Every structure is written in C-alpha cells, then in structure tokens.
C-alpha cells in the first residue's frame, strides 16, 4: 500500500529540486514491505559533473529523510541541451 505515497512524495521532491529541468523517469519496486526507488532527473548538459552529482546526492538524502517506507534510493541524471 505504500507505493502510491512513496512515488508521489519522491517525484514531488525531485521535480522541484535545484537544477532539475524535469524528471525523466521514476521506478518503484516492491520488495516485501519495502519500496526500492530509482529516479532519473534531466539536468543541463553543460553543468559540471561535480554540480550534477551534488544535486543527485541532495535529492537522495531528502527522499531518504522525508519519505516513509522507501529503502534504497538511487538518483541518476540524464543530460539535456537547454534552449
């Protein structure tokens, strides 16, 4: 039953984080009572990797801190050319 809350809350965190151009994809997997989550964010292609890495880490930390029932969280980045 927790998948619905996990996915909404995690998506809402990611979508409004600094440097996120938009969410690319979100995946939730039930493992017993736990939800494993993978999220991939679109980020400016020309950002430095140190900066994109900080963004991914901050999103991960915040989802882990704030979202109940999520066990593992992975946050990946997809570059996008910004018009």
Q: Does 74 bind its own copies (CB under 8 A)?
A: no
Q: Which of 25, 45, 49, 72 binds its own copies (CB under 8 A)?
A: 25
32 vs 50, beta carbon nearer its own copies: 32
Q: Minimal CA–CA distance to 73: which of 46, 21, 42, 34?
A: 34
Strands (DSSP E) along 1-69, which ranges? 22-31, 34-44
Which burial class, exposed, middle or buried, applies to 24 when counting CB atoms under 10 A from its CB (0-12, 13-18, 19+)?
Answer: middle
Stretch that binds its own copies, among 15-23, 46-54, 59-67, 68-76 (CB under 8 A): 15-23
Smallest distance, Å, CB 28 to its own copies? 5
């Amino acid at each position: 039953s927790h998948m619905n809350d996990v996915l909404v809350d995690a998506y809402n965190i990611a979508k409004d984080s600094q440097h996120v151009h938009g969410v690319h994809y979100i995946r939730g997997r039930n493992v017993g009572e736990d939800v494993h989550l993978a999220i991939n964010i679109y980020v400016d292609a020309d950002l430095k990797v140190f900066e994109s890495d900080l963004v991914a880490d901050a999103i991960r930390r915040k989802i882990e801190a704030e979202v109940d029932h999520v066990r593992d969280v992975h946050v990946g980045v997809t570059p996008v050319r910004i018009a």
